[PDB]
Design an enzyme around this catalytic site. Sequence first.
Site, short mmCIF file in Angstrom:
data_model
loop_
_atom_site.label_atom_id
_atom_site.label_comp_id
_atom_site.label_asym_id
_atom_site.label_seq_id
_atom_site.Cartn_x
_atom_site.Cartn_y
_atom_site.Cartn_z
N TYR A 213 9.87 9.25 11.13
CA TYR A 213 9.92 10.46 10.45
C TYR A 213 9.09 10.45 9.16
O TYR A 213 8.51 11.59 8.93
CB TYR A 213 11.58 10.90 10.02
CG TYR A 213 12.50 10.80 11.25
CD1 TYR A 213 12.63 11.96 11.71
CD2 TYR A 213 13.44 10.04 11.48
CE1 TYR A 213 13.77 12.27 13.00
CE2 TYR A 213 14.37 10.03 12.39
CZ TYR A 213 14.30 11.27 13.23
OH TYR A 213 15.04 11.49 14.13
N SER B 133 0.91 -1.38 -0.16
CA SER B 133 -0.02 -0.06 0.02
C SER B 133 0.90 1.13 0.10
O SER B 133 0.77 2.15 -0.75
CB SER B 133 -0.86 0.20 1.30
OG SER B 133 -1.98 1.23 1.17
N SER B 134 1.91 1.51 0.97
CA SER B 134 2.54 2.56 1.06
C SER B 134 3.43 2.73 0.05
O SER B 134 3.97 3.88 -0.47
CB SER B 134 3.20 2.73 2.22
OG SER B 134 2.19 2.72 3.45
N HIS C 214 19.40 1.88 18.68
CA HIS C 214 18.35 1.22 19.17
C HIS C 214 18.87 -0.34 19.33
O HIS C 214 18.35 -1.22 19.75
CB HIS C 214 17.26 0.81 17.77
CG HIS C 214 16.30 1.91 17.56
ND1 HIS C 214 15.21 2.31 18.31
CD2 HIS C 214 16.24 2.76 16.59
CE1 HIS C 214 14.71 3.16 17.83
NE2 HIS C 214 15.32 3.66 16.62
N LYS D 279 13.55 24.37 12.52
CA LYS D 279 11.94 24.58 12.34
C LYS D 279 11.19 24.89 13.64
O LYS D 279 10.20 25.48 13.41
CB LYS D 279 11.61 23.10 11.72
CG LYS D 279 11.98 22.74 10.43
CD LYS D 279 11.15 21.76 10.03
CE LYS D 279 10.53 21.94 8.46
NZ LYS D 279 9.32 22.71 8.46
C1 HEA Z 1 7.25 10.74 15.87
C2 HEA Z 1 8.20 9.68 16.29
C3 HEA Z 1 9.47 9.75 16.81
C4 HEA Z 1 10.34 11.14 16.67
C5 HEA Z 1 10.10 12.36 15.97
C6 HEA Z 1 11.55 10.88 17.38
C7 HEA Z 1 12.74 11.63 17.43
C8 HEA Z 1 13.94 11.23 18.36
N1 HEA Z 1 14.34 10.27 18.91
FE1 HEA Z 1 12.82 8.41 19.11
N2 HEA Z 1 11.76 6.74 19.18
C9 HEA Z 1 10.33 6.56 18.62
C10 HEA Z 1 9.70 7.63 17.81
C11 HEA Z 1 10.47 9.06 17.67
N3 HEA Z 1 11.33 9.47 18.00
C12 HEA Z 1 9.79 5.36 18.92
C13 HEA Z 1 8.40 4.78 18.42
C14 HEA Z 1 10.75 4.62 19.65
C15 HEA Z 1 11.06 3.25 20.50
C16 HEA Z 1 10.77 2.10 19.23
C17 HEA Z 1 10.56 0.92 20.05
O1 HEA Z 1 11.39 0.43 20.88
O2 HEA Z 1 9.52 0.34 20.16
C18 HEA Z 1 11.93 5.66 19.77
C19 HEA Z 1 13.21 5.30 20.62
C20 HEA Z 1 14.42 6.12 20.60
C21 HEA Z 1 15.75 5.58 20.67
C22 HEA Z 1 16.09 4.32 21.12
C23 HEA Z 1 16.29 4.40 22.59
C24 HEA Z 1 16.16 2.91 23.29
O3 HEA Z 1 15.31 2.04 22.63
O4 HEA Z 1 16.64 2.48 24.01
C25 HEA Z 1 16.63 6.87 20.53
C26 HEA Z 1 18.04 6.88 20.76
O5 HEA Z 1 18.58 7.86 20.66
C27 HEA Z 1 15.60 8.14 20.25
C28 HEA Z 1 16.33 9.34 20.17
C29 HEA Z 1 15.44 10.43 19.29
C30 HEA Z 1 16.17 11.76 19.05
C31 HEA Z 1 17.42 12.45 19.38
C32 HEA Z 1 14.95 12.30 18.06
C33 HEA Z 1 15.16 13.88 17.68
O6 HEA Z 1 14.86 13.92 16.23
C34 HEA Z 1 14.75 14.81 18.38
C35 HEA Z 1 15.05 16.36 18.01
C36 HEA Z 1 14.05 17.18 18.64
C37 HEA Z 1 14.42 18.35 19.56
C38 HEA Z 1 15.93 18.30 19.95
C39 HEA Z 1 13.43 19.27 20.11
C40 HEA Z 1 13.67 20.78 19.51
C41 HEA Z 1 15.24 21.20 19.15
C42 HEA Z 1 15.71 22.36 19.69
C43 HEA Z 1 14.63 23.45 20.13
C44 HEA Z 1 17.11 22.62 19.26
C45 HEA Z 1 17.84 23.06 20.86
C46 HEA Z 1 18.38 21.94 21.40
C47 HEA Z 1 19.54 21.43 21.85
C48 HEA Z 1 20.55 22.61 21.87
C49 HEA Z 1 19.60 20.50 22.64
N4 HEA Z 1 14.25 7.83 20.44
CU LIG Z 2 15.50 5.84 16.22
#
Ligand code: HEA
Ligand SMILES: [Cu+2]
Lengths: 66, 236, 55, 51, 102, 534, 45
Positions: free
Chosen positions: F245, F157-158, F291, F319
């Site tokens: 993403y 689908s996707s 991960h 952003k």
């Molecule tokens: C929409 C879904 C989504 C999004 C957008 C993200 C975004 C990010 N994620 Fe995430 N993540 C998940 C969904 C998501 N994640 C899911 C589902 C899991 C678990 C999966 C599972 O095990 O089932 C997971 C797990 C996960 C892990 C694995 C950890 C583990 O399992 O042990 C890590 C590791 O680094 C991580 C990090 C990040 C980081 C750095 C971002 C970065 O993109 C964030 C960046 C955003 C900002 C930083 C905010 C705004 C920034 C500023 C205002 C700048 C100024 C800041 C500084 C100077 C610090 N997340």
């Molecule tokens: Cu990740």
Amino acid sequence: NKGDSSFIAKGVAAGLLFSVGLFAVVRMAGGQDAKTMNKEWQLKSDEYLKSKNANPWGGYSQVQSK
Amino acid sequence: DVPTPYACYFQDSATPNQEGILELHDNIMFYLLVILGLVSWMLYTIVMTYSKNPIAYKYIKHGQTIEVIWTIFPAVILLIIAFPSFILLYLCDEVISPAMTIKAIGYQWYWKYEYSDFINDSGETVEFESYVIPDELLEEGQLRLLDTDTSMVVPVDTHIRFVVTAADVIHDFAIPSLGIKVDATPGRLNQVSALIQREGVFYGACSELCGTGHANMPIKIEAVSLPKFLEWLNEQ
Amino acid sequence: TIAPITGTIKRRVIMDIVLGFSLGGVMASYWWWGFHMDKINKREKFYAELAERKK
Amino acid sequence: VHFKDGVYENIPFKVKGRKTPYALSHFGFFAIGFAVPFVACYVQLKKSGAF
Amino acid sequence: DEETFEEFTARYEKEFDEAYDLFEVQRVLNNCFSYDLVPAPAVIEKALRAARRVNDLPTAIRVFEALKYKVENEDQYKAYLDELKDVRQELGVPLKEELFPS
Amino acid sequence: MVQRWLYSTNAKDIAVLYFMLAIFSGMAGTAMSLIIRLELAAPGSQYLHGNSQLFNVLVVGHAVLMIFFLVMPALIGGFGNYLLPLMIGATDTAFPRINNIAFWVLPMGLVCLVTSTLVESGAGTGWTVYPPLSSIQAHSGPSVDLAIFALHLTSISSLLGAINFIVTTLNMRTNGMTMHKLPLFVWSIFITAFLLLLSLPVLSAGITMLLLDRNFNTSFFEVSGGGDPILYEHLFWFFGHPEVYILIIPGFGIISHVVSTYSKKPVFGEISMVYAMASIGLLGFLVWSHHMYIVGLDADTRAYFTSATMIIAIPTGIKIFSWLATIHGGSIRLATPMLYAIAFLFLFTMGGLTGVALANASLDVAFHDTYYVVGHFHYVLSMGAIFSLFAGYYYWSPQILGLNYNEKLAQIQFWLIFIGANVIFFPMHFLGINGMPRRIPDYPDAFAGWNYVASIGSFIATLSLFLFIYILYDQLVNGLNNKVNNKSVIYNKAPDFVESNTIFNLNTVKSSSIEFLLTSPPAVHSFNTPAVQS
Amino acid sequence: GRIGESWVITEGRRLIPEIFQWSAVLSVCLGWPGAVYFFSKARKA
Ligand code: HEA
Ligand SMILES: [Cu+2]
Ligand code: HEA
Ligand SMILES: CCCCCCCCCCCCCCCC(=O)OC[C@H](COP(=O)([O-])OCC[N+](C)(C)C)OC(=O)CCCCCCCCCCCCCCC
Ligand SMILES: CCCCCCCCCCCCCCCC(=O)OC[C@H](COP(=O)(O)OCCN)OC(=O)CCCCCCCCCCCCCCC
Ligand SMILES: CCCCCCCCCCCCCCCC(=O)OC[C@H](COP(=O)(O)OCCN)OC(=O)CCCCCCCCCCCCCCC
Ligand SMILES: CCCCCCCCCCCCCCCC(=O)OC[C@H](COP(=O)(O)OCCN)OC(=O)CCCCCCCCCCCCCCC
Ligand SMILES: CCCCCCCCCCCCCCCC(=O)OC[C@H](COP(=O)(O)OCCN)OC(=O)CCCCCCCCCCCCCCC
Ligand SMILES: CCCCCCCCCCCCCCCC(=O)OC[C@H](COP(=O)(O)OCCN)OC(=O)CCCCCCCCCCCCCCC
Ligand code: CUA
Ligand SMILES: [Ca+2]
Ligand SMILES: [Mg+2]
């Protein structure tokens, strides 16, 4: 319109009350408490942990029940 | 050593590795609080003043000074905390001059411990299995889903190498107060190091979904003194 | 005659940004010197008395 | 192919001019969605002998 | 956009003289009050004389209402009402506070 | 009637089917998360009679429904298929019959996943389906096969939809519109379509190889034949991160339109917004092993992935500051879509800052399988992507449907989900830092405190969803009356300060995209003579 | 010169009330779990 923000604050507070009181009705169909969730059992747990020197600067107490 | 009700922080540390993990968490949270203070303040003082602005500034669409400045500022902050984060990474990976090695093997819902340095007076392998005490068999005062029928005994102030593997599916050897977490994969051996600075009992759990019994497979470790460990070792 | 009036909104974005760094910089200062330094000094007192019990 | 235009013409379901009230379709459709996890639980708890 | 204040007045003075109906006088006025500055007294005078030429009194009232929003103090609002004294009197334009007094 | 909705080749009609299926699926996935939170309320067996396999089954069903059957068919299958052809002047999509098969495989993938939970014992494996727990020794019978076939049908689908989105954007733009002139929402579906095209085929290799071990006597991952379980995780996570993403960027483009409309200002630095969306989509292919920080990789491998993960915070923070720069100096109008967008800026920042801590491999030793991780990804997926989905519906549905909604009822709905979502997920960080593992139906007694608080908030948020179901009913039965009484908002932009009431009636709409210039329910033949821009 | 009062006095009069309203909002968003523990059995007995 005038009078709408007060309708909104009253509707939010009435939605909080209904969900919380519905949780307490579904809880009444849940299973019995675990046999260890009492103050009497939790105070002998602390007896064992104080001997083993558990958590020497942040506390080890397990007492959270009646 | 043990979790506590309504706790919102790390369990107390017993090793230099968990001392350093906590130091890096606190160092990072210093800068995440500056950033959250800015963003939440700008958001608050923009809604409160421009929800009552009748003429919008529609001709402001870019700025060269602020856009360059706010691209460089997050890079400096990110670089500041990467320096101690790299040092801690290489300080925990080293396992240099240990005095004893213990093997831990994960099974479908129990653990297994083996000592094979042959230090005991008769020079055999000391080995036993560890099981959670069932709810029906608990004695009053023992801790549910934590206490086991046998435990692992180690001495204090000694460098120890842990060797971890598995038999059937993936498990995970984890003890929060010691700074230990490592997957246990059928087929390979991983290693970790520890040095315990005080006596007591430290509790852990399995951390790799392993089926129906994923919640019933805890880890319990006792640290005693050296003359006390040799007496326990020479009997069991 | 009336002198020109300009740059009202330019100079009130400088004060917002300065205020945001100052406000977030006092929340972070309490976290370090109030909370984190508090737990470090308790830990260091348990150990420094443990060595004396070893004499 | 030529279709009609208007307000209630770009949706697959009928809302007006129907015999049965539209509330039976609207909330019946979302009730069946909310109810499939409970059918699964019933089958599996009736396999373990819990029932 | 590098336009000095002196170039700003000389361009909107030209822009108020060419407006030929109500839509044009209101559209030019909207863009003149949307910058990060208060228009000079000589620009306000040409905006009043443009609404007279299309015969619309509420647009001339709103001119002074926007003026009291854009200034920084209430003594900047007063000094404008003291420069445009004759024109507000010669065309017969009241202030919104004078018209709906509280 | 039969051939308009079973034989369809129109992109607007197909987008309506997507939204109907997407919302029917969020019902089931919310019901599963409610059963999960009732069993976690207190220590001991509570409602499932000690059946731990059943608790694990409901957790897989919860994640698969929310991701592959709600958020993707609504943000992409729904809004992408409806608003992308209208925003660029296209008379249809390219490949209209491909556009129809990419919907009708999702109903067949649901009657594969549902029958998977009813056969034998279901799949109690987690949504990542690691072997050897998911092989025939530790999971016998046909349950894991039927879940893999369900995932295969969502990939068809996707992928097919992504090929259609890419050709339409590049080939069917209207007179004068160049790639630098696209609306920001069109850019967000275009970049997302490329991530799907380069990550889905690696997942189809991993889970087809898992099907071969189970049924065809193969040793990709079996340890007795030489295979390696750690290979599966590399193949699964090389699709996983790009997926998160694929779930946030379409919401980045929605937030851009809403914030600009209710400020009366254009997006600040619009060209650097496209460059940031492209940099985040590229750096999302170089970070996947954050991960796998504790499975035994080398120390120099782990130091690379630390720095690669951290630098995605720079484009994302551009952003965030850009969005705060467009509302500064604005004329803010606090309708319902604007409330969600302001909450998105505050709740997405919090979820992203807990990710920066997780990005360091040294600190992730205390953050593996910890509720702390569960707290991170429900702040960016449920107060993130979900909040942008509500913002979209309230923004475009009056135009799409021709029917208005009760405004003051919608502001009650917003506050009930904002309060209730925070109550579920904020204490999850407290449980994790103290050391509570994830994927357990039962826990030690010291974790009872925060687990009770989170189960209460789960009832608050489900009540807010039931109010949204009533708001849909009120809009469909009373939508025409909501325009003549004063119960709804008619204009999302009000007259300017010096603009009179009657001059405003000459041009009611001041829009920088086509979609608000059509008839309220847009015509089935929307363009005959092509639209033209300078 | 400049007409009226200094821009510091005008801006001071507008921000000081908002600093206190900001700190009273962020404390509720981040400190509400502290109230749950206040009325618990585990706390201070
Ligand atoms: C929409 C879904 C989504 C999004 C957008 C993200 C975004 C990010 N994620 Fe995430 N993540 C998940 C969904 C998501 N994640 C899911 C589902 C899991 C678990 C999966 C599972 O095990 O089932 C997971 C797990 C996960 C892990 C694995 C950890 C583990 O399992 O042990 C890590 C590791 O680094 C991580 C990090 C990040 C980081 C750095 C971002 C970065 O993109 C964030 C960046 C955003 C900002 C930083 C905010 C705004 C920034 C500023 C205002 C700048 C100024 C800041 C500084 C100077 C610090 N997340
Ligand atoms: Cu990740
Ligand atoms: C799309 C992603 C998504 C969403 C929305 C949610 C929503 C929720 N999730 Fe979940 N969750 C996951 C993705 C998501 N989750 C994943 C990947 C996992 C891990 C699986 C794993 O461990 O294997 C997980 C795991 C997980 C666990 C871990 C269980 C365990 O480890 O065994 C728990 C526990 O409470 C939980 C709770 C919740 C709750 C209470 C909500 C609720 O708060 C929801 C709140 C809001 C709503 C009620 C939803 C809105 C309703 C709609 C239908 C939207 C309609 C909108 C329009 C059409 C405009 N989630
Ligand atoms: C201004 C700041 C914010 C302001 C803050 C506002 C929010 C404040 C929240 C505080 C309220 C929190 C209360 C938590 C709910 C609760 O405590 O329930 C108590 C018990 C059930 O609690 P339990 O301990 O989990 O039950 C044990 C399970 N067994 C062993 C029984 C099987 O329940 C019982 O069994 C006895 C009670 C039975 C239910 C009757 C009570 C009233 C409900 C009436 C129903 C109305 C709605 C239902 C309509 C059908
Ligand atoms: C935030 C902490 C607590 C949150 C949880 C409890 C929420 C309160 C319960 C619901 C309140 C109902 C009030 C009625 C509506 C009202 O107030 O309307 C009054 C005003 C305008 O209406 P009016 O008065 O001019 O006309 C009234 C005519 N009848 O609308 C508002 O300002 C809405 C404010 C918008 C906020 C956007 C979303 C906020 C979340 C983002 C996070 C904020 C940043 C955090 C960091 C500082
Ligand atoms: C969005 C995710 C945010 C991440 C937050 C995760 C947690 C980080 C660690 C925070 C430490 C809390 C101090 C413990 C106090 C204590 O001592 O707690 C004491 C009691 C119970 O303690 P007790 O009786 O068991 O023992 C010790 C008895 N003295 O609890 C409470 O008062 C609960 C109060 C909650 C605390 C508010 C948290 C504010 C932090 C904001 C973080 C902002 C995020 C930054 C950007 C991401
Ligand atoms: C059960 C009733 C039978 C009555 C017996 C017949 C006697 C005469 C009565 C006359 C009624 C005829 C019954 C025909 C069936 C019917 O009209 O409603 C019955 C229909 C079912 O049918 P379906 O075609 O939708 O397919 C689906 C079958 N699985 O419910 C519904 O979908 C309710 C759905 C409403 C919820 C959708 C809300 C979405 C709104 C659109 C917003 C889109 C936004 C897009 C943004 C991208
Ligand atoms: C489980 C075993 C795996 C089976 C694979 C899944 C099978 C599903 C599709 C079954 C084939 C039916 C033919 C439909 C295709 C078609 O007809 O393409 C023909 C389309 C028709 O264009 P049009 O009619 O839309 O426009 C009308 C214009 N006249 O030309 C195009 O688009 C041009 C681009 C061609 C791309 C085709 C891609 C091939 C589709 C399969 C992709 C599967 C990817 C996953 C791989 C595992
Ligand atoms: C941003 C969003 C913010 C929303 C605000 C949250 C309010 C929504 C409702 C929250 C549900 C409460 C869960 C109670 C669970 C329970 O049962 O509590 C039990 C505890 C006792 O403990 P026990 O061991 O005896 O339990 C025994 C189990 N059977 O009794 C209580 O403490 C009563 C609740 C206290 C009220 C506080 C509510 C929070 C309001 C914050 C106000 C601002 C504070 C600012 C401080 C700086
Ligand atoms: Cu072994 Cu989970
Ligand atoms: Ca339980
Ligand atoms: Mg794991």
